[PDB]
Design a protein around this ligand. Sequence first.
Ligand SMILES: CC(C)CCC[C@@H](C)[C@H]1CC[C@H]2[C@@H]3CC=C4C[C@@H](O)CC[C@]4(C)[C@H]3CC[C@]12C
Ligand SMILES: CC(C)CCC[C@@H](C)[C@H]1CC[C@H]2[C@@H]3CC=C4C[C@@H](O)CC[C@]4(C)[C@H]3CC[C@]12C
Ligand SMILES: *[C@@H]1O[C@H](CO)[C@@H](O)[C@H](O)[C@H]1NC(C)=O
Ligand SMILES: [K+]
Ligand SMILES: [K+]
Ligand SMILES: [K+]
Lengths: 271, 271, 172, 46
Amino acid sequence: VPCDSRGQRMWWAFLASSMVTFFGGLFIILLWRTLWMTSVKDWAGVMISAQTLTGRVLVVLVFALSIGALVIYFIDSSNPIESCQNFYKDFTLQIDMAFNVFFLLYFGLRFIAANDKLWFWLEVNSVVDFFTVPPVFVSVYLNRSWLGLRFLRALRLIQFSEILQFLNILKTSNSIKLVNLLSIFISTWLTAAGFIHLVENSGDPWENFQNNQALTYWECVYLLMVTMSTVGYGDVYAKTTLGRLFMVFFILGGLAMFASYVPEIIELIGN
Amino acid sequence: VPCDSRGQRMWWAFLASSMVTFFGGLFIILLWRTLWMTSVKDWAGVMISAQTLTGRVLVVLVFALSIGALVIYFIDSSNPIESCQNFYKDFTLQIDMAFNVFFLLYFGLRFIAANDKLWFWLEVNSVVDFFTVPPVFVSVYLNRSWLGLRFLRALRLIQFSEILQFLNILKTSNSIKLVNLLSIFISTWLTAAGFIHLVENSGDPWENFQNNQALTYWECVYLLMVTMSTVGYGDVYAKTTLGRLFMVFFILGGLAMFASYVPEIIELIGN
Amino acid sequence: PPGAFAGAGALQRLDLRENGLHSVHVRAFWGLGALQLLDLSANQLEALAPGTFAPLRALRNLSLAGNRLARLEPAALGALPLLRSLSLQDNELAALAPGLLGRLPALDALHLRGNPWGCGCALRPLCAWLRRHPLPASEAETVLCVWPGRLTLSPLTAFSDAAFSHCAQPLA
Amino acid sequence: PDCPEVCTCVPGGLASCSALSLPAVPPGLSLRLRALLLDHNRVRAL
Ligand SMILES: CC(C)CCC[C@@H](C)[C@H]1CC[C@H]2[C@@H]3CC=C4C[C@@H](O)CC[C@]4(C)[C@H]3CC[C@]12C
Ligand SMILES: CC(C)CCC[C@@H](C)[C@H]1CC[C@H]2[C@@H]3CC=C4C[C@@H](O)CC[C@]4(C)[C@H]3CC[C@]12C
Ligand SMILES: *[C@@H]1O[C@H](CO)[C@@H](O)[C@H](O)[C@H]1NC(C)=O
Ligand SMILES: [K+]
Ligand SMILES: [K+]
Ligand SMILES: [K+]
């Protein structure tokens, strides 16, 4: 009786659970635009303000939980992408569930403290919440699990420099700028490796997932590092069509970003 | 009865023989900080001073012995990494032993002439002494031999330009700077190739050393040259996990070092 | 070769065993659909092209014992209403695609002895067919399956709907 | 059941299947057979 099998792929349900949140609520906001609130808005604004102690400890907490979620994803990346499991049996899924409900509460608190709802809805933190939080609820409901876009929490590493600034660890502007550049580069490297790993190990959808390549996450990190330095050994490369398209887009975006960030590098070098 | 076999790997003993020197004596220095000497300190300072004849001939001697040790390592790199041998039978090991005891005596003489012991303990010459000299004593005691970190003596090539300066061979500052840059580049190239060769031919430790790749030292030198020029043929590459991690770190460090050294290259080009 | 048995349109029995066959071209039985017995046992067949048995219509009992088949595509077998018995014993079949048995009505006799069956969600249609069509007790004892990670002591017919409860049906 | 279709039975649980060119194990397996002979039968997999 105890057995585990892949069965039928259910990735589309998990993806739709985020798409019909994001796009549908964006349309709702647009239609509302076409067609004690101040007190609670001010209360939520002072709740998440970086000046007060509560905002500081809360952003430190959400950064720590994002680090924990990234570690959980790193651990779970050594498993089959789609697999059945029992929510009550395993407690790591419970830890991820607690992390994600905390993220959801933080997102709601941020949304209350928003002067412009539409521009808040297009932030990177909002979209990472949209593409991270509904999948865990769908997974615990369906009693299955899909790897999905759980690496996108690494995009919160951009806040890392700010986490230092109000703990009296960084004072000068040059060190803050250097830490910001390093964090941005590391975060985009990790998330690009995450997309490459997902699209390579998942396989092509229109070819019944027969193009899957057994690539670990760290091998994809190595591939991204080799590619971004314009070395290209060719020992490991993307074989799927969508993987190659993503590699081309990543090459173009990385070259454009480096060309845009050259002047900041020169300023850091200085005279 | 006469036979040679690898048996059990004893690399950890050789590595620990340097770690429990370096870290333990660093802790001893720190604890001493928490808790005729001037005459002998001045005597040792004038003994190793570059102004006097003794200091000049002694630094020339230690540079020559470093060259000899590098040649010995180059010769011995064409052998199995860990092998049993008789100290009395072979006299090349005796030559290396004499070189290393001279290095130890020089290190002691330097340590006496040190105003700040802790900052002396973190110098590159001190750490290369720590990671070179105890292994030969452990090898002659255990009657075995491990290749180890014996390529790090190439890091003493950096003083090569200084060796010319007080022999009336270089006078202008531009030639001295050019020779210094060339020596630094050659030394870091050789030591990176040494680490790559060791980590590739040794194999992964957690996988019972079944990932060993038959790479010669000069093939690794060729690989480093191909990588640092951003060519990346892919004919030879690191297959082990630790080798790939070292390659990624070397790529990042080389790019950062080249970006930092661009202004000196421009100054050498001049107008 | 294609059309190897051309001219024998009224053929009823065809036996090919101990011949060591290793490659059968598609549409090689053009006009041979009239046969009722087809023995392709004791050979080295590995893969079957789809539509190979499509011209066969009156075939009743088919034997594929002692071969090197690993995956049996449903398209290769097609729909044979007049088939009554089928044999896959002494082969290298690990799992059967769902819905393969439902294509044909009559599958009264089935022999799967010696195949390295890896019991799993995939085998659940076969187990359901065993519930509908019980095997003989001796054949049930002989036919077993491999349990991954542990001993293969679990019989194929010992599984029930509780094992099927793990399988996720298409969502409503 | 104690006697395989192609093999020979000898009392004492002895089964002889010498030189039969069997592709695999014969189906005649029973608890009574305490000695099975499968020499030179061209079997290749277990
Ligand atoms: C920027 C983010 C938030 C939104 C963009 C949507 C991206 C991430 C989506 C759109 C199409 C998606 C792919 C569509 C099909 C499959 C096949 C299946 O095996 C799951 C993964 C994979 C390969 C998906 C990965 C994620 C994907 C590439
Ligand atoms: C900068 C220097 C002085 C200190 C840094 C420590 C480095 C050199 C140490 C730490 C871990 C070490 C590795 C650990 C395990 C093995 C496996 C064995 O087959 C010996 C070599 C090898 C591959 C070691 C090579 C040296 C190594 C990489
Ligand atoms: C199938 O073939 C014939 C039907 O003509 C029948 O006698 C025979 O017993 C059947 N074979 C099996 C293995 O049931
Ligand atoms: K290249
Ligand atoms: K290049
Ligand atoms: K290349």
